[PDB]
């Protein structure tokens, strides 16, 4: 109903922004920067689990489906959230990983940092180009949680299909709020669902580098236990080609 509205629930369950504790007294190194970012990321993923448990409908899914969706989508959630923070703090000019850890053009020059930061900046630049509202962002972020699935389907497929329909309608409500006409509303829905589809390609490159760093420990970068457990499960499924994106537009 409207007391409370679903969108007000999404606003109140959004986690607070975490700080990194990064020590910038001495110069950066790619190893200590990436290890700091992985540790922050593990803490952000724990917050994302608490968020997902609070999402209306999510706990109607089989527990194994809840585990699968979070394991498959965590990088999309974290990159999208990073895009929003970077949009609000710097209009997408810098990557705001935490309020005490902002990556500018010079830190991107570190070894192995440039290509991954370029992909993350592209996400932030889309929020700028489309002038995404907070409520559009919140609805789109739920849909990312529901956008990467096993090819063999989920245990609670019918529940999942209904959850996805509910939050697609909620994104529509957030669009209509901007007070455009019906034709403008459909065009904006097209633009935002195209952005959602593009996240699979933009995040796929981030995952491949993450997987590479996890497996080969290039420069011996550390991962927290939370990410190491998820990555250890996610990588074989992705490598076997057993995962598929759910797309709004035919590819």
């Amino acid at each position: 109903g409207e007391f409370p509205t679903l969108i007000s629930l999404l606003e109140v369950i959004e986690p607070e922004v975490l700080y990194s504790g990064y020590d910038s007294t001495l110069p950066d190194t790619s190893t200590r920067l990436m290890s700091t970012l992985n540790r922050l990321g593990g803490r952000q993923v724990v917050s994302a689990v608490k968020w997902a448990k609070a999402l209306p409908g999510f706990r109607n899914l089989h527990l194994d489906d809840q585990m699968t969706l979070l394991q498959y989508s965590w990088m999309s959630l974290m990159a999208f959230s990073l895009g929003w923070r970077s949009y609000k703090q710097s209009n997408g000019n810098m990557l705001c990983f935490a309020p005490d850890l902002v990556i500018n053009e010079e830190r991107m020059q570190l070894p192995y940092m440039y290509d991954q930061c370029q992909q993350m900046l592209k996400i932030s630049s889309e929020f700028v180009r489309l002038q995404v509202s907070y409520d559009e962002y919140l609805c789109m972020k739920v849909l990312l949680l529901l956008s990467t699935v096993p090819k063999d389907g989920l245990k609670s497929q019918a529940v999942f299909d209904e959850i996805r329909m509910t939050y697609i309608k909620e994104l529509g409500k957030a669009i209509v709020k901007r007070e455009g006409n019906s034709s403008q509303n459909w065009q904006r829905f097209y633009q935002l669902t195209k952005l959602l589809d593009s996240m699979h390609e933009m995040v796929g490159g981030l995952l491949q580098f993450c997987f590479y760093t996890f497996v080969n420990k290039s420069l011996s970068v550390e991962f927290p236990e939370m990410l190491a457990e998820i990555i250890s499960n996610q990588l074989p499924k992705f490598k076997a080609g057993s995962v598929k994106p759910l797309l709004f537009h035919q590819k």
Binding site: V46, V49, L63, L70, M226, E229, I230
Partner: peptide, 11 residues
């Protein structure tokens, strides 16, 4: 399989 994740989701 992932212990921390399962412990969190089990409440």
């Amino acid at each position: 399989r992932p212990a921390i994740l399962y412990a969190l989701l089990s409440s």
